[PDB]
């Protein structure tokens with residue numbers, strides 16, 4: 162309902178220019194097509210789709226931001242092409258049987274935390290025509306090892322001496338909370354490992370709960386204090402100009418930053434070591450169970 | 463209920479060292495006294511009060527953080543002195559008739575936004591002994607003129623061109639929202655003006671809704687784009703070592719930062735000009751009505 166969410170998303174240039182570049186550089190995907198923008202917000206993606214030659218764009222949003230979108234569409238003289246519908250995409254009546262293309266920015270922290278993927282897959286199954294397309298079409302989640310004894314002390318050991326008083330019992334409440342924040346790439350001590358690969362054409366809501374063994378190729382002898390998670394978004398199907406962006410620490414900052422799982426017990430690793438563990442994501446809000454160096458912890462965000 | 467609020471408050475050194483210094487440098491205020499900590503959190507102020515020679519400290523908190531406080535008090539071997547009570551200070555039964563000293567950190571953004579002052583004044587009226595003391599005892603709110611055409615363009619004019627599309631109608635929704643953020647002291651273009659003076663010994667919840675004429679002595683010929691608000695906290699009554707801290711832009715950053723009211727229509731001012739306006743605060747959440755250069759706007763936070 163709040164303009165603040167839409168301001169931060171629109172001011173993320175990696176995000177918004179990626180969608181803009183996909184749409185403007187692949188207009189053959191949109192030309193004379195019926196396009197559904199799931200959770201359209203201000204209507205920015207509906208308007209990209211219209212300028213790329215869409216026959217009809219249906220922007221749907223459940224929130225009061227749609228009333229801003231109605232006015233914005235009119236200011237840009239696209240009400241001829243873009244029809245806006247207020248309500249849950251699961252609930253509303255659409256004035257078409259079927260759509261050629263679905264577009265959405267559905268992605269949460271660590272891809273899946275408080276994500277809309279559920280609503281997009283509903284829209285796909287209800288409304289996507291035989292041989293239609295969904296964008297972005299491919300997503301991955303990666304983990305990477307971190308060494309940052311200073312940031313670990315600042316969040317954990319901090320509680321041992323607070324202006325002369327012991328507050329040690331507070332550490333049990335901090336460890337299980339994933340942190341969202343921009344990591345210094347200098348603190349990465351492994352190659353990343355892919356733990357999940359989603360093609361939005363072939364996935365179901367049940368595929369989004371997963372387990373993966375992983376191996377982190379250690380590149381620096383150090384104390385491992387944390388595992389960081391991020392995701393890569395690809396526009397591929399039928400593209401003459403493929404688009405990708407990363408939310409990883411070695412790439413430009415996005416409003417997603419990185420998701421960080423602090424280790425209760427940091428442990429030493431050696432350059433050339435293959436660090437083996439297991440990660441499981443449950444949908445329930447989202448939880449991440451991490452097994453590493455013969456201990457297991459469950460995190461939430 | 464969440465550790466995150468308490469972490470940010472405890473890591474604010476201006477805040478926490480101010481309370482620590484008041485209590486440790488004025489132990490004659492606490493010696494053999496019965497002390498009530500309203501909204502005690504982790505119990506940090508209860509423990510300061512105990513080390514300064516308190517006969518009995520009653521820490522009261524409505525939230526689950528009290529269960530952490532019960533353990534923390536035990537880790538520091540002060541359960542002899544500090545009794546912790548779970549519930550609203552308005553509701554709970556205290557094991558005393560009366561208290562000598564009330565201590566609290568009740569202060570919101572711009573002092574009064576989502577502040578606990580209501581609950582402390584209830585505690586004062588119910589439980590403060592004849593000739594008892596409340597700390598901090600004196601608070602002020604100040605306004606100051608700002609020139610920052612770049613930050614104003616980044617929040618307002620931004621909406622006129624969003625990746626080639628007009629979103630101008632969004633400005634009406636942004637202007638009425640106070641911003642909390644740390645100002646560059648280089649962007650201040652007036653002496654501050656005091657608009658409110660609270661002595662917690664002599665105020666009532668009705669005094670917290672106020673109107674004030676103000677005069678801002680302009681120090682730099684410029685465009686005025688915003689009015690900023692902040693507050694100063696004083697520990698005075700019976701102190702051999704008075705303590706004060708500011709949340710103003712010319713002082714060290716606190717977790718309160720500054721509250722900024724963006725002007726819909728920036729206007730030019732001349733060094734030596736006495737800029738006259740009127741501010742009114744209503745309790746309702748909090749609203750701030752501002753009259754300046756012959757236009758009025760109501761803000762919320």
Ligand SMILES: N=C(NCCCSC[C@H]1O[C@@H](n2cnc3c(N)ncnc32)[C@H](O)[C@@H]1O)Nc1cccc(-c2ccc(Cl)cc2)c1
Nearest residue numbers: 165166169200202222223224249250266267268269270280
């Ligand atoms: N970028 C994000 N994309 C996820 C998705 C973000 S809502 C996108 C839009 O869809 C709407 N909608 C949702 N479910 C719907 C439904 N079933 N049917 C119809 N509409 C539906 C909804 O009203 C909204 O307008 N996520 C996100 C992740 C991390 C941080 C932030 C963030 C950052 C900064 C701030 Cl200040 C606030 C938030 C945002």
Ligand SMILES: N=C(NCCCSC[C@H]1O[C@@H](n2cnc3c(N)ncnc32)[C@H](O)[C@@H]1O)Nc1cccc(-c2ccc(Cl)cc2)c1
Nearest residue numbers: 466467470501503523524525550551567568569570571581
């Ligand atoms: N520093 C602040 N002090 C105001 C007050 C802050 S609660 C203090 C404590 O009193 C409790 N309580 C409240 N009403 C009560 C009652 N009637 N009876 C009994 N207990 C009561 C409550 O459970 C809590 O534990 N405010 C504040 C202002 C601006 C920003 C932030 C902030 C910054 C960062 C983050 Cl991550 C989160 C929040 C905090």
